[PDB]
């Protein structure tokens, strides 16, 4: 799912034109009446088989590109179902598979019928009949291609989460400063907007602390976004980083945040919980001044500890002539006393005797 | 076929009557001329339609239609014209001026401010500060969400960090200079209401007096 | 790979004629000329 690596899905009209053009360009297209009936039958059969092979190959590639929902991880499958109606996607894939099987059956029937062809017109009519039926089947499966293409675009844009490694899930009230803390902690810069549910989708960012890799995953404020956040937090080996607005500057009262945390406690069970008192200047309780940006590093270190407990010569060469063009001279880098002697050469061998080896 | 420019079409279905619409405007102007009194000559100005509607609200209706169409329909010659001595009044009658019935003091004194347009001259020389753009020339107690305004403006502004930034200062207008197309567009975008609507009440077409003064 | 008639390669050959060639060959001819 998150692996993407799926080729673009063309439209129904584009796919039909691509298939027909490929068959026309690859297969021969010169068959006169002077050839034998067997040759005419063979030419028609070859064209039909090539068209069938091209259609089958594209359909198989489309079917293989879409990952199986069952084989995906429980967190990935839940997110896909919440975001893209996995039941509808499975129905579309099944419909495409059925259409491919029907196309292959139609091609096989047409090939068998054309094997006993009579004349050029009968072969030409049979060749047209198979192509039209394949085109009709392709045109019939029109909305499925559009739905699959949208799913592929969403899947490619989706993040590649890694719940297996140590992770810190930041979820809670919208704009409670958890997103700002996650943006500061990780290299990723999550967009923050005054409108609620600004981070509609999850944002995952890697971080390094105490020679360990921690995956900071932000969640939408708590709707489809809320449901996706709940599904991600349900199946993930991660530490909860719920943030409560101490100053209530996020628009959510302290009592409301506490009630939401108590309700979401079922998902936060069997995990290290952190209660981040946001906007202090404006379950382990840690005070982090969202307005003053104070205590974020301490909270991150505390959460990480809880999770762990729970679990030049080159410059000269480039300036002079550049790499591969500048000849480095080892004569200069010598400890010879006389500079003239170091820069001057000596006879290695003379008169049949190695002067260097005999001096 | 032939080399001709293509003509575009839309689906509003709100086309005016054209010749019939002009005839209706002339008929309404004649009825307004035949109205009771107040002998108003005022239709529009540089102000917006909302200002015109507000002005027309305090009346019991400003209407001109096409400029000089009513005068042409009435006739330059006094015999053709319903009024008297309209030969000289026809030349004076021009622009957006129309009859109305309710005023004189409000027109003379009250002149609501409105956004300026091209062709006029700004009363001062407003200078746009460099750096981040200010919607109200730094009078707000300037949102950064006007990203599309950077492309729409066309001025030397670079969208740096999602905020429009001006590399160098550029005055919007200069005193003693006519309002150009860009200057008028910038003035309309900003808070520059360098305009004041006026009215024309030189004369009155009295039923009995029939004395349209030229003052 | 591009062939020897690659238009860019001819352009780069022209550029390098006046960089690592030309002058050091002209005076080279001059030296054995005055000889």
């Amino acid at each position: 799912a998150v692996f993407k690596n799926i080729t673009p899905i063309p439209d129904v009209n584009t796919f039909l034109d691509v298939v027909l053009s490929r068959t026309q360009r690859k297969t021969p297209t010169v068959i006169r009446s002077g050839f034998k009936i067997s040759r005419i039958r063979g030419f028609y059969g070859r064209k039909v088989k090539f068209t069938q092979d091209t259609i089958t190959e594209k359909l198989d590639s489309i079917l293989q590109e879409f990952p199986k929902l069952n084989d995906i991880h429980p967190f990935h499958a839940d997110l896909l179902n919440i975001l893209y109606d996995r039941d509808h996607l499975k129905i579309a894939l099944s419909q495409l598979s059925t259409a491919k099987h029907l196309v292959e059956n139609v091609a096989r029937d047409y090939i068998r019928l054309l094997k006993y062809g009579d004349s050029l017109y009968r072969c030409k009519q049979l060749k047209r009949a198979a192509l039209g039926r394949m085109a009709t089947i392709i045109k019939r499966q029109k909305s499925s291609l559009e739905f699959l293409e949208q799913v592929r675009q969403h899947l490619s844009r989706l993040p590649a989460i890694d719940p297996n490694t140590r992770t810190l899930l930041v979820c809670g009230y919208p704009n409670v400063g958890k997103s700002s803390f996650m943006n500061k902690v990780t290299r990723a810069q999550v967009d923050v907007q005054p409108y609620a549910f600004t981070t509609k989708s999850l944002f995952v960012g890697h971080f390094d602390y105490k020679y360990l890799r921690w995956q900071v995953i932000d969640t939408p404020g708590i709707n489809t976004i809320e449901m996706q956040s709940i599904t991600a937090m349900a199946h993930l080996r991660s530490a909860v980083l719920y943030f409560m607005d101490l100053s209530e500057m996020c628009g959510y009262s302290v009592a409301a945040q506490v009630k939401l945390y108590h309700s979401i406690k079922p998902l936060f069970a069997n995990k290290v919980t952190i209660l981040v008192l946001n906007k202090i200047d404006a379950v382990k309780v840690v005070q982090t001044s969202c307005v003053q940006d104070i205590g974020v590093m301490d909270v991150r270190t505390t959460a990480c500890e809880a999770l762990l407990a729970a679990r030049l010569a080159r410059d000269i060469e480039a300036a002079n002539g550049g790499a591969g063009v500048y000849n480095v001279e080892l004569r200069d880098k010598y400890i010879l006393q006389d500079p003239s002697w170091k820069y001057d050469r000596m006879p290695e061998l003379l008169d049949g005797k190695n002067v260097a080896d005999f001096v | 076929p032939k080399s001709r420019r293509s003509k575009v079409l839309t689906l509003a279905q709100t086309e005016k009557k054209g010749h019939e619409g002009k005839a209706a405007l002339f008929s309404g102007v004649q009825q307004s001329l035949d109205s009771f009194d107040y002998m108003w000559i005022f239709d529009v100005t540089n102000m917006r339609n909302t200002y015109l509607k507000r002005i027309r609200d305090d009346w019991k209706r400003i209407f001109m239609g096409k400029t000089k169409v009513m005068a042409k329909a009435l006739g330059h010659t006094p015999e053709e014209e319903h009024a008297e001595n309209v030969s000289k009044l026809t030349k004076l009658l021009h622009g957006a001026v129309g009859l109305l019935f309710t005023v004189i003091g409000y027109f003379e004194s009250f002149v609501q401010n409105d956004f300026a347009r091209a062709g006029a001259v700004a009363p001062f020389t407003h200078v746009i500060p460099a750096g981040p753009v200010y919607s109200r020339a730094g009078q707000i107690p300037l949102t950064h969400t006007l990203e599309p305004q950077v492309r729409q403006l066309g001025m030397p502004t670079v969208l740096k960090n999602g905020v429009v930034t001006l590399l160098a200062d550029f005055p919007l207008c200069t005193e003693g200079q006519q309002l150009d197309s860009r200057q008028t567009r910038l003035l309309k975008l900003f808070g520059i209401t360098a305009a004041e609507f006026k009215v024309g009440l030189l004369g009155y077409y009295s039923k009995k007096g029939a004395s349209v003064e030229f003052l | 790979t591009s062939g020897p008639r690659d238009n860019n390669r001819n352009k780069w050959a022209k550029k390098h004629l006046k960089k690592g060639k030309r002058a050091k060959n002209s005076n080279f001819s001059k030296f054995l000329k005055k000889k």
Partner: protein, 165 residues
Amino acid sequence: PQNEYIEESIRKHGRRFDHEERKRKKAAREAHDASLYAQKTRGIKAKLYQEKRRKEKIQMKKTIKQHEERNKRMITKATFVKYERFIRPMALRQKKANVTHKELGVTMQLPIIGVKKNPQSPTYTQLGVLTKGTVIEVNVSELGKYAQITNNPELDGCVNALLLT
């Protein structure tokens, strides 16, 4: 990256400096491009543009019209299954026929119960050869009734017939 990342890039950095003008120029010059295209291209791709442009004019004319009102010895033909002197190929033989009802106007795939009469030849009628104009009886319980084959099964590849009703 995550989700709409160039949409994040467009937000925080901006668009290409001249994209709006280039897209405007491309749209403006498209008319010259299409007219040029209609004259230079040749072959299959030209014939596709010819058919595609003819279609576009037809729908465009309609959309305007919708605008204004708003304002060896073997059988060589497909058959259905001494007397069998010839050979009837199994692949050529067909058992199901697509019969379209006249009043209902619906095509139903019914089994070929038998062949009533083939006007081409009584031997073909005896052999049950499915040809154009041949009368064949099919089950109508789910709708037995006769029907005339209005197509050529040897060329179309399907037994497309119309109900005699």
